[PDB]
């Protein structure tokens, strides 16, 4: 019996839409505690029967690049300190250290010696060095995916498993900017007990801690049992730096990081610096610390005080490792022997404070408030809203996107059969997890790192992107050709694949034409993979060198085919215009592949001297005055011109779109008798302020609404075909693209903001849609939260992520904007909708980054636009804070972000070549997913091991019967099975033994993992 995530609002002591809607926003001066106020304790509340423990976390905060690459970072920093962490803990048993970032320790444990190693495990075993969480990273939580927040928190989690012997169950998340609900709902499916935030508003920090709502049990925003629900501490202060851990005081606190006394380079801005604890300053000093603690412990319901000891790279020196301990040592000697403070303090571990905590709670000591929601968008002071980063360096958001999808398919691709070591299989799997696990960094793909540095994940990310390739290609070669005909050579490219939308036409000539000839190779076999669980049909499109081409599947049937012309645009810097150009020698075949579930299918493609019977050819008309020719070689149809002017288009019995003489959508019709809808597509730009705080990689300072970029008189062209149409629009920065093939449009923009400095660039969607200030965007990909537009809060905080959709929606309509990469957006206005698509800024925005953003470079953007009757939709009532995809705007969805993968036979022969796989593979519910497929055993293992990840979303019911479908068993899908487990979602802790070796298929909104053991 599943939970109704739609008809039921979920009954919470804080509900973050809620607590919004009410809460002031005033920026008013607390204080020593800038942005909160000045906190009262009555000495008499702890006393001999009621000590307040006090547990001093050291931890040291590595990003995995940032201001100098990964690899930098480990040489001049991080080796250092994990080196001298090893010697420290080793040689004073009651220090402590916590660590989160397993990229780093794996790169260091692997260098050390068999000695070292021995002492680490030791250190480890004792409970000094603690690892919390123990992902790959510290991911970001706004514009990653849930996905890829998964492989990395698995990449780490296993590291930690095979090598140290531990699984965290505590979570420390101290510096993304934002945090997101999707990572409770990971972790506690991922065996956690607790977690840790901090980087949330600060007017939101001041409304918990005035109501000790500041620790919570953080539940899902549409779990009304409460069984998503996972421990929380929200850290109170500003940072979590030295002078912002102690208490509320940082001119105190300051004091207290004895780190800053001269020889390291660093003071207090507060203009106070610590000094040595001594005997004759030791009661003074800590009568100074436990006030401060004890303040900090009036924002907590317990007696059990959590005080965090560190910052940014810390705990490299020996000297340093000396100054904090000793220095601290006295202070507990001093503190713990004086009974007036009733005080027991020490050093500790994450899982020490909340297993204390929880003791306290057992008691009776304390109960925990309810709380669901989010905490975007970010704030650390005045109107500094973090917004910027949701869209900063966007060429790499997409690849993130791209690569997600290539991972995913080389690891279920290759799943299917075990490996000889010498396919090198398993390491270039792990080499690509590794890759976008490390991007999920919170200055990965957020945006926000140096120069230098996004050019290190740019270039590994191609590297993994080149490993998935190989990976996947072996794979198909093995599935479809006759096993007693395979004969791999491991190291050969048998496919290379083909992308249409990435890097992206305009962005990279990569694309490989097919060569055909009459005089050289008369056919050439492609293959299609199809990643999720359900039959598929999609068009696929390939460059061919003669227009003369037909199709065929693998029982010779006649597949219907269309050709178009091969169409660049170009900024010509003689005539001062952006237009197209068509090639004469190749041309694009496009035609409807229909793949199996988690299969593939064969096509042929063979030339001929004339028109084929089976393949059509689309028309081009040029919209613009003063038109010069475009010939196209052999393409059957000239090209035909005109002055712009309006036009409207219908592919198949599907919407027909009205554009604007400036190619931009106007109205859409969703069907022959029905109103044409006004949707119009704009593009604005944003500028950046002359007086004041400045936007730069992280921050969102416009300076006012959008002004429309000025278009001129811009040249469009369409392309009108029996399979696709199209127009498309060079715009100043944009070249504009709106794509039909008889269902929601699919929209691509080439955008190159070049040259133009301090402009963002938006796209909006105006509409007539009655929605008020109600908006909707989606959290990684895996839930939608309603927003409301305040008009209390700047516009900037009115910015979300949209990592994967947006919808806006009255009593009867929706529009739903899904996109292929993470970006900003908003809806400013009833009935509008906009997603930024680049920002360049000259300026530095003070957060430590040290630059602006000016290496924008040429990214295709690509999105599906679903417009929908939604009044016969059972939709949540109007107080529940979710909302919910239609199985349309869903499956756009999946068509961006998982689409059909195309492999193109690299040789002129394929002998043994198969026409399909997976034909008998169960095409599952539509909203079911198979997110992940991983074999989890090398070839050696007596036992293999198959690990699947499903996930299944909540669809609108809109009266569409959509009946009969196959159960999905994963635990069958490979044969000889011989135990079916349920999995924590990291594969490392099995939690069910499953009857007659069946996998149960999840409930919305729900996930589960499943390891199927094979004989072999
Ligand atoms: C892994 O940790 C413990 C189980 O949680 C021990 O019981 C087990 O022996 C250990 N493995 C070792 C120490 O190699
Ligand atoms: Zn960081």
Same mark, same amino acid.
């Given at each position: 019996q599943c939970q109704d995530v739609v008809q039921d609002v979920p009954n919470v002591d804080v509900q973050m839409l809620e607590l919004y809607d009410r809460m002031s926003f005033k920026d008013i001066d607390g204080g020593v505690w800038k942005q909160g106020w000045n906190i009262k304790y009555d000495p008499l509340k702890y006393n001999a029967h009621h000590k307040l423990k006090v547990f001093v976390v050291p931890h040291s905060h590595n990003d995995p690049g940032w201001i100098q690459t990964f690899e930098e970072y480990y040489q001049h920093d991080t080796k250092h300190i994990l080196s001298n962490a090893l010697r420290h803990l080793h040689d004073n048993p009651e220090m402590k250290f916590i660590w989160?970032? #397993?990229?780093?320790?794996?790169?260091?444990?692997?260098?050390?010696?068999?000695?070292?190693?021995?002492?680490?495990? @030791?250190?480890?075993?004792?409970?000094?060095?603690?690892?919390?969480?123990?992902?790959?990273?510290?991911?970001?939580?706004?514009?990653?995916?849930?996905?890829?927040?998964?492989?990395?928190?698995?990449?780490?989690?296993?590291?930690?498993?095979?090598?140290?012997?531990?699984?965290?169950?505590?979570?420390?998340?101290?510096?993304?900017?934002?945090?997101? /609900?999707?990572?409770?709902? *990971?972790?506690?499916?991922?065996?956690? &007990?607790?977690?840790? *935030?901090?980087?949330?508003?600060?007017?939101?920090? &001041?409304?918990?801690?005035?109501?000790?709502?500041?620790?919570?049990?953080? =539940?899902?925003?549409?779990?009304?049992?409460?069984?998503?629900?996972?421990?929380?501490?929200?850290?109170?202060?500003?940072?979590?730096? #030295?002078?912002?851990?102690?208490? /509320?005081?940082?001119?105190?606190?300051?004091?207290?990081?004895?780190?800053?006394?001269? @020889?390291?380079?660093?003071?207090?801005?507060?203009?106070?610096?610590? !000094?040595?604890?001594?005997?004759?300053?030791?009661?003074?000093?800590?009568?100074?610390?436990?006030?401060?603690?004890?303040?900090?412990?009036?924002?907590?319901?317990?007696?059990?005080?959590? #005080?965090?000891?560190?910052?940014?790279?810390?705990?490299?020196?020996?000297?340093?490792?000396?100054?904090?301990?000793?220095?601290?040592?006295?202070?507990?000697?001093?503190?713990?022997?004086?009974?007036?403070?009733?005080?027991?303090?020490?050093?500790?571990?994450?899982?020490?404070?909340?297993?204390?905590?929880?003791?306290?709670?057992?008691?009776?000591?304390?109960?925990?408030?309810?709380?669901?929601?989010?905490?975007?968008?970010?704030?650390? !002071?005045?109107?500094?809203?973090?917004?910027?980063?949701?869209?900063? !360096?966007?060429?790499?958001? =997409?690849?993130? =996107?791209?690569?997600?999808?290539?991972?995913?398919?080389?690891?279920?691709?290759?799943?299917?059969?075990?490996?000889?070591?010498?396919?090198?299989?398993?390491?270039?799997?792990?080499?690509?997890? !590794?890759?976008?696990?490390?991007?999920?960094?919170?200055?990965?793909?957020?945006?926000?790192?140096?120069?230098?540095?996004?050019?290190?994940?740019?270039?590994?990310?191609?590297?993994?992107?080149?490993?998935?390739?190989?990976?996947?290609?072996?794979?198909?070669?093995?599935?479809?050709?006759? /096993?007693?005909?395979?004969?791999?050579?491991?190291?050969?490219?048998?496919?290379?694949?083909?992308?249409?939308?990435?890097?992206? @036409?305009?962005?990279?000539?990569?694309?490989?034409?097919?060569?055909?000839?009459?005089?050289?190779?008369?056919?050439?076999?492609?293959?299609?993979?199809?990643?999720?669980?359900?039959?598929?049909?999609?068009?696929?499109?390939?460059?061919?060198?003669?227009?003369?081409?037909?199709?065929?599947?693998?029982?010779?049937?006649?597949?219907?085919?269309?050709?178009?012309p091969v169409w660049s645009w170009h900024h010509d810097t003689l005539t001062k215009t952006i237009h197209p150009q068509g090639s004469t020698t190749k041309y694009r075949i496009i035609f409807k592949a229909r793949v199996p579930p988690m299969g593939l299918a064969t096509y042929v493609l063979t030339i001929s001297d004339s028109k084929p019977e089976h393949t059509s050819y689309a028309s081009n008309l040029l919209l613009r005055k003063n038109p010069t020719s475009l010939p196209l070689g052999q393409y059957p149809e000239d090209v035909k011109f005109g002055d712009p002017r309006e036009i409207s288009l219908r592919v198949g019995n599907g919407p027909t779109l009205a554009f604007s003489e400036q190619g931009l959508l106007k109205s859409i019709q969703l069907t022959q008798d029905s109103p044409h809808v006004p949707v119009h597509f704009k593009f604005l730009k944003y500028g950046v302020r002359s007086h004041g705080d400045r936007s730069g990689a992280y921050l969102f300072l416009p300076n006012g609404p959008a002004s429309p970029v000025e278009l001129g008189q811009p040249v469009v062209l369409v392309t009108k075909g029996k399979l696709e149409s199209s127009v498309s629009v060079g715009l100043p920065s944009v070249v504009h693209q709106t794509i039909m093939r008889g269902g929601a449009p699919e929209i691509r923009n080439l955008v190159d903001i070049g040259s133009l400095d301090n402009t963002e660039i938006v796209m909006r969607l105006e509409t007539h849609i009655d929605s008020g200030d109600i908006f909707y965007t989606d959290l990684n990909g895996l839930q939608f939260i309603k927003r409301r537009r305040l008009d209390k809060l700047p516009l900037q905080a009115n910015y979300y992520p949209i990592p994967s959709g947006m919808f806006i929606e009255d009593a009867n309509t929706r529009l739903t904007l899904l996109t292929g990469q993470p970006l900003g957006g908003s809806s400013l206005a009833s009935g509008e909708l906009e997603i930024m698509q680049d920002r360049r800024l000259a300026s530095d925005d003070e957060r430590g980054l040290g630059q602006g953003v000016l290496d924008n470079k040429p990214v295709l953007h690509i999105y599906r636009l679903v417009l929908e009757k939604v009044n016969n939709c059972v939709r949540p009532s109007k107080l529940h804070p979710a909302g919910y995809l239609t199985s349309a705007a869903h499956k756009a969805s999946q068509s961006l972000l998982d689409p059909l993968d195309k492999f193109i036979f690299a040789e002129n022969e394929w002998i043994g070549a198969q026409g399909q796989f997976g034909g008998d593979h169960p095409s599952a519910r539509e909203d079911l997913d198979v997110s992940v497929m991983r074999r989890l055993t090398k070839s050696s293992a007596k036992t293999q091991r198959v690990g699947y990840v499903l996930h299944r979303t909540n669809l609108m019911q809109c009266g569409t019967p959509e009946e009969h479908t196959q159960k999905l068993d994963v635990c069958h899908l490979l044969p000889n099975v011989a135990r079916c487990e349920r999995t924590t979602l990291t594969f490392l802790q099995n939690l069910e033994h499953l009857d007659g070796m069946v996998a149960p298929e999840v409930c919305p909104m729900e996930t589960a993992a499943y390891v199927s053991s094979h004989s072999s």
């Open positions: 989160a970032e #397993i990229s780093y320790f794996a790169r260091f444990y692997h260098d050390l010696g068999e000695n070292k190693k021995l002492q680490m495990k @030791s250190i480890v075993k004792n409970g000094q060095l603690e690892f919390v969480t123990g992902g790959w990273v510290m991911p970001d939580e706004a514009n990653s995916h849930w996905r890829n927040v998964l492989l990395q928190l698995t990449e780490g989690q296993t590291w930690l498993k095979q090598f140290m012997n531990v699984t965290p169950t505590a979570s420390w998340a101290i510096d993304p900017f934002g945090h997101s /609900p999707t990572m409770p709902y *990971i972790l506690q499916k991922s065996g956690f &007990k607790n977690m840790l *935030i901090q980087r949330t508003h600060y007017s939101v920090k &001041k409304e918990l801690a005035q109501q000790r709502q500041l620790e919570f049990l953080w =539940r899902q925003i549409w779990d009304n049992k409460g069984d998503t629900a996972l421990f929380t501490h929200m850290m109170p202060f500003y940072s979590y730096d #030295i002078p912002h851990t102690c208490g /509320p005081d940082p001119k105190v606190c300051c004091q207290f990081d004895f780190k800053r006394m001269g @020889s390291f380079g660093l003071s207090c801005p507060w203009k106070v610096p610590p !000094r040595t604890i001594s005997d004759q300053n030791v009661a003074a000093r800590s009568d100074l610390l436990v006030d401060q603690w004890k303040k900090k412990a009036e924002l907590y319901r317990t007696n059990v005080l959590l #005080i965090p000891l560190g910052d940014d790279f810390r705990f490299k020196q020996n000297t340093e490792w000396d100054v904090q301990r000793v220095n601290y040592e006295r202070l507990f000697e001093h503190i713990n022997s004086q009974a007036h403070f009733n005080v027991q303090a020490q050093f500790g571990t994450l899982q020490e404070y909340f297993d204390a905590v929880h003791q306290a709670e057992r008691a009776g000591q304390a109960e925990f408030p309810t709380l669901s929601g989010d905490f975007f968008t970010y704030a650390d !002071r005045s109107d500094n809203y973090w917004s910027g980063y949701y869209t900063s !360096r966007p060429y790499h958001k =997409r690849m993130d =996107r791209v690569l997600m999808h290539y991972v995913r398919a080389a690891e279920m691709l290759s799943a299917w059969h075990s490996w000889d070591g010498m396919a090198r299989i398993e390491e270039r799997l792990e080499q690509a997890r !590794r890759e976008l696990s490390l991007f999920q960094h919170h200055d990965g793909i957020t945006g926000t790192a140096k120069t230098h540095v996004v050019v290190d994940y740019e270039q590994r990310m191609q590297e993994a992107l080149k490993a998935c390739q190989m990976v996947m290609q072996q794979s198909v070669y093995r599935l479809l050709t006759k /096993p007693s005909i395979y004969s791999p050579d491991f190291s050969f490219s048998y496919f290379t694949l083909d992308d249409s939308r990435w890097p992206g @036409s305009g962005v990279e000539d990569s694309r490989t034409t097919i060569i055909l000839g009459e005089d050289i190779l008369p056919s050439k076999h492609v293959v299609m993979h199809n990643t999720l669980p359900h039959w598929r049909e999609q068009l696929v499109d390939f460059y061919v060198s003669s227009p003369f081409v037909s199709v065929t599947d693998l029982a010779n049937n006649p597949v219907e085919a269309q050709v178009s």
